[PDB]
Design a protein around this ligand. Structure first.
Ligand SMILES: CC(C)CCCCCCC[C@@H](C)CCC[C@@H](C)CCO[C@H](CO)COCC[C@@H](C)CCC[C@H](C)CCC[C@@H](C)CCCC(C)C
Ligand SMILES: CC(C)CCCCCCC[C@@H](C)CCC[C@@H](C)CCO[C@H](CO)COCC[C@@H](C)CCC[C@H](C)CCC[C@@H](C)CCCC(C)C
Ligand SMILES: CC(C)CCCCCCC[C@@H](C)CCC[C@@H](C)CCO[C@H](CO)COCC[C@@H](C)CCC[C@H](C)CCC[C@@H](C)CCCC(C)C
Ligand SMILES: CC(C)CCCCCCC[C@@H](C)CCC[C@@H](C)CCO[C@H](CO)COCC[C@@H](C)CCC[C@H](C)CCC[C@@H](C)CCCC(C)C
Ligand SMILES: CC(C)CCCCCCC[C@@H](C)CCC[C@@H](C)CCO[C@H](CO)COCC[C@@H](C)CCC[C@H](C)CCC[C@@H](C)CCCC(C)C
Ligand SMILES: CC(C)CCCCCCC[C@@H](C)CCC[C@@H](C)CCO[C@H](CO)COCC[C@@H](C)CCC[C@H](C)CCC[C@@H](C)CCCC(C)C
Ligand SMILES: CC(C)CCCCCCC[C@@H](C)CCC[C@@H](C)CCO[C@H](CO)COCC[C@@H](C)CCC[C@H](C)CCC[C@@H](C)CCCC(C)C
Ligand SMILES: CC(C)CCCCCCC[C@@H](C)CCC[C@@H](C)CCO[C@H](CO)COCC[C@@H](C)CCC[C@H](C)CCC[C@@H](C)CCCC(C)C
Ligand SMILES: CC(C)CCCCCCC[C@@H](C)CCC[C@@H](C)CCO[C@H](CO)COCC[C@@H](C)CCC[C@H](C)CCC[C@@H](C)CCCC(C)C
Ligand SMILES: CC(C)CCCCCCC[C@@H](C)CCC[C@@H](C)CCO[C@H](CO)COCC[C@@H](C)CCC[C@H](C)CCC[C@@H](C)CCCC(C)C
Ligand SMILES: CC(C)CCCCCCC[C@@H](C)CCC[C@@H](C)CCO[C@H](CO)COCC[C@@H](C)CCC[C@H](C)CCC[C@@H](C)CCCC(C)C
Ligand SMILES: CC(C)CCCCCCCCCCCC[C@@H](C)CCCCCCCC(C)C
Ligand SMILES: CC(C)CCCCCCCCCCCC[C@@H](C)CCCCCCCC(C)C
Ligand SMILES: CC(C)CCCCCCCCCCCC[C@@H](C)CCCCCCCC(C)C
Ligand SMILES: *C/C=C(C)/C=C/C=C(C)/C=C/C1=C(C)CCCC1(C)C
Ligand SMILES: *C/C=C(C)/C=C/C=C(C)/C=C/C1=C(C)CCCC1(C)C
Ligand SMILES: *C/C=C(C)/C=C/C=C(C)/C=C/C1=C(C)CCCC1(C)C
Lengths: 222, 222, 222
């Protein structure tokens, strides 16, 4: 279509789709109750992303927000995606270390605050206020990274896989606020097709690569 | 009012209302923790449906979507309903067989994908794309029916009630994609008043009849 | 700004903000798994409220609804807030008395029905129907108060704290339907700046004061 970023959305659609099917087939036969939690999470995440990538590709998950006296194309469907996939990803890490329920509730809650404020900043028509929402969202992310790092006699397999998955998370999630900031939702320093490209690379690595690393460890089994 | 289907919405409103009160009174006195889960679910489902049937009757849960160069009346409130009641119904079956948590998460996740994609197809302005969303939703339903059928030393009361409730589910839920397809959200082969009528009969049977069958078995008690 | 109620929104924003940070710092060091559930809840609630109070202050959580041949300013962001904070508050009480899961599901479900119908009444363009939604919401609240009162060998610390927190709840929550009824969402007998003021006093007491009382008892620890 006439949207330069269409190619990255089609590509993202394809990659999330293939990853979903891949995890689906791989989870076939799993009977371990613990492993079943990781397969479910690991398959559900790209499955949701696929649908949200498809609605962006078809034009449904897109809206125009006026600001800076311009009509800016905002892909709201990413928040619909993140709203469910990021807490699911956080659950995988938490089941991993057998996190206390209070901690999980804190993470999920901070995460929803994180995505919900980013969405409000994304749709805000007063330019300066967009960055206020961006800051609160960022504060929520730092909270989460903090607990991932400092809130966590576990099996050496568990820790070993956790450290890896936790380093992956901190590095890939921290990039999202930067893309947003430099991208069309914020300062507009990077054009929307490049921004969509960056998010597509982060999403697939945060979702497919994360699940491949996760589904490789024996830490997921009881 | 001037909407021929008003009668089925009023009737559905009434039936969900009466069923709610019926289950409410019947659940009075229940102290068994397990039974309390089924009563809660069984009462909550028609309670939600009542509210969504009432907003359709009053005109709130209705919106016009343009497609095929026409202005089509779409009852979005059904998805608001289904979004919560279908996973609750799936929970009753899963508690029944004492399903593993990983399986429940898979079912709820597929279910949300199922209703969320159907809603997007319902609101999509490009005619052909409506059917793409319809197909993905259908694929999610088949997944669910698959696990209900093939993902499931349980008490003979449990199995016995499960088989019945599971046959009911497969038969009534499979009809929804067909109604949508033939109805005003899809090919428009069946007029909206007939479609609302069909959904009302499915909803009450899927909700009230399902709960009557459920609340009759001793399988729900510990 | 040009909205007389801005001062109460700024003030509410400030108070929820300060309470969040206060609970955050106080929860530092907590290792008891049970206590962690109460701190998380107690911090998450004002944290969400802060964000919703800020979007009201900035004008984002506000919309005009026509009715009575007038264009009425409706703060929809309060429902976005309540939708998550009221079930969380109900969870604190339920963990307190160690409520059965079936009961919790009933409370959360009734609560969502309560806030969701109030939101629909809030956005309804037919004046008389607003009060129908108001009534169903009120019926859902009475249900909840009923179970809090009559659905509940617990530690004397637990009961003692529960009675207090339960008396607080019944008294503050029962005021919300009255404010709405007399306020701009209903009969319009009280102007919007006074209504916002009343809700701000209820919100801070229902959220910050409730959490201070809660976080004072040894009932929250194992
Ligand atoms: C918990 C724990 C944490 C609580 C989070 C705190 C912050 C909550 C803020 C949220 C409020 C939502 C704002 C938004 C829905 C308001 C919609 O109005 C839009 C902007 O005025 C209209 O623009 C055009 C419309 C655009 C549409 C975007 C909608 C998006 C939907 C994503 C959610 C989905 C719901 C699952 C449905 C299936
Ligand atoms: C931000 C703190 C961390 C926490 C405080 C929370 C939010 C505070 C506001 C952040 C920064 C507001 C918002 C100010 C943007 C400012 C450039 C607006 C300038 O107005 C110009 C015309 O009046 C708009 O041109 C438009 C030209 C655009 C290309 C300019 C883009 C603005 C940029 C915003 C920068 C914010 C970050 C650098 C925050 C990183 C710290
Ligand atoms: C950090 C500390 C909080 C920042 C305090 C600032 C106070 C702003 O004062 C008024 C300007 O005189 C802002 O209202 C004038 C109009 C504008 C309103 C913006 C004020 C609010 C955004 C203040 C809420 C704090 C923000 C949260 C930024 C993220 C935080 C978690 C670090
Ligand atoms: C975008 C890429 C970085 C650029 C090119 C990628 C090549 C270099 C990758 C950098 C990453 C490396 C992280 C490795 C980690 C290994 C540490 O393992 C430790 C074992 O105990 C974990 O403890 C403690 C571990 C500590 C690890 C902290 C990770 C750092 C956090 C960075 C967050 C992100 C970077 C900010 C985003 C940027 C785009 C603004
Ligand atoms: C999980 C696990 C699975 C994740 C699901 C994957 C698919 C998610 C898709 C969802 C995205 C929502 C789309 C929709 C909200 C966008 C709203 O915009 C409408 C169509 O442009 C506006 O039309 C007119 C507006 C119409 C209004 C319809 C809204 C409906 C609301 C139903 C949800 C409710 C939320 C509970 C509130 C109380
Ligand atoms: C569908 C597969 C299972 C999986 C693939 C996912 C979606 C693929 C598209 C499905 C079918 C698109 C969509 C094509 C509809 C086609 C009739 C549109 C014709 O265009 C006409 C004018 O150009 C519109 O008249 C309007 C006249 C209407 C009365 C015609 C209604 C269209 C019907 C759609 C039929 C789809 C199903 C039969 C799928 C069952 C398999
Ligand atoms: C809409 C009605 C069907 C039409 C009139 C209703 C009268 C006939 C009802 C058909 C139904 C009968 C199902 C009975 C079942 C009994 C099987 O019990 C078995 C015991 O182990 C369960 O194992 C395995 C059980 C297997 C059962 C599979 C059920 C079939 C699935 C049908 C799904 C729906 C039909 C598709 C919808 C249609 C409207 C396009
Ligand atoms: C369960 C258990 C219980 C089930 C509850 C039963 C009752 C459910 C009713 C709900 C339906 C939602 C209605 C509403 C979203 C429809 C939106 O359309 C508005 C009014 O036509 C548009 O006005 C202008 C738009 C305004 C925007 C208001 C949206 C609000 C959003 C609050 C929810 C948030 C979602 C978390 C996002 C982060
Ligand atoms: C309500 C029962 C408990 C349960 C039934 C569920 C809803 C039933 C409807 C409630 C009451 C409808 C709605 C009737 C409002 C009525 C005054 C409308 C009058 O119409 C006037 C012009 O025609 C509008 O002037 C506008 C002037 C306004 C200032 C008038 C405000 C109306 C008030 C509504 C009063 C409802 C409560 C007192 C319910 C408490 C019991
Ligand atoms: C209490 C009992 C239920 C009230 C019964 C009333 C029936 C209304 O009859 C029609 C007027 O002849 C209403 O439709 C005419 C147009 C109007 C439609 C309103 C009818 C519905 C609102 C009836 C649904 C009951 C309401 C729920 C009020 C709260 C309830 C939980 C106490
Ligand atoms: C808004 C304020 C009331 C006005 C000024 C405040 C000063 C007086 C506060 C009233 C409150 C007092 C409640 C104390 C309680 C103490 C009872 O403890 C008992 C120990 O077993 C609990 O069992 C059973 C306890 C029973 C307690 C029932 C509480 C009452 C319920 C009132 C709900 C609210 C009032 C309706 C709102 C109004 C604004 C229309
Ligand atoms: C069987 C396994 C290994 C995987 C097959 C699933 C296929 C789907 C795509 C998986 C891609 C992700 C690899 C890990 C993370 C990233 C660094 C990839 C970023 C995305 C961009 C291009 C990647 C190349 C290709 C996989 C086409
Ligand atoms: C005490 C029990 C048995 C039930 C009383 C609750 C009353 C409310 C309506 C219950 C209806 C559902 C019966 C099971 C399923 C269906 C096949 C019914 C489809 C709906 C259409 C008309 C049904 C007739 C009537 C119940 C008015
Ligand atoms: C360390 C403790 C005690 C608390 C400090 C947190 C500060 C934030 C505000 C807390 C206010 C709530 C007190 C309990 C409930 C209410 C009756 C208060 C209603 C709100 C209106 C004004 C209150 C005064 C002030 C706290 C500024
Ligand atoms: C599958 C996708 C993932 C893992 C998404 C992570 C997205 C983030 C961590 C988002 C963070 C944001 C903020 C911290 C600042 C405001 C903007 C956001 C929403 C991009
Ligand atoms: C209480 C109502 C119930 C039990 C609803 C079930 C509804 C379905 C199983 C819906 C399925 C759909 C698809 C499979 C295709 C697309 C359209 C839908 C949303 C009707
Ligand atoms: C943190 C805020 C809290 C504790 C909110 C409680 C709000 C209520 C109990 C709301 C009730 C309502 C009804 C009973 C009637 C209709 C209007 C509402 C939504 C205000």
């Amino acid at each position: 279509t006439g949207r330069p970023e269409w190619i990255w959305l089609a590509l993202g659609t394809a990659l999330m789709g293939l990853g979903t099917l891949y995890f689906l087939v791989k989870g076939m036969g799993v009977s371990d109750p613990d492993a079943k939690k990781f397969y479910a999470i690991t398959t559900l995440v790209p499955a949701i992303a696929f649908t949200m990538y498809l609605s962006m590709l078809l034009g449904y998950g897109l809206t125009m927000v006026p600001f800076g006296g311009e009509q800016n194309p905002i892909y709201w469907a990413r928040y619909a995606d993140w709203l469910f996939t990021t807490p699911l990803l956080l659950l995988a890490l938490a089941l991993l270390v057998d996190a206390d329920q209070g901690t999980i509730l804190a993470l999920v809650g901070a995460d929803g605050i994180m995505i919900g404020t980013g969405l409000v900043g994304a749709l805000t028509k007063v330019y300066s206020y967009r960055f206020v929402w961006w800051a609160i969202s960022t504060a929520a992310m730092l909270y989460i990274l903090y607990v991932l790092f400092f809130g966590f006699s576990m099996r050496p397999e568990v820790a070993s896989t956790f450290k890896v998955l936790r380093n992956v998370t901190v590095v890939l999630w921290s990039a999202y606020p930067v893309v947003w900031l430099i991208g069309s939702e914020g300062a507009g320093i990077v054009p929307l097709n490049i921004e969509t490209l960056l998010f597509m690379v982060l999403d697939v690595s945060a979702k497919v690569g994360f699940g491949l690393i996760l589904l490789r460890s024996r830490a997921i089994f009881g």
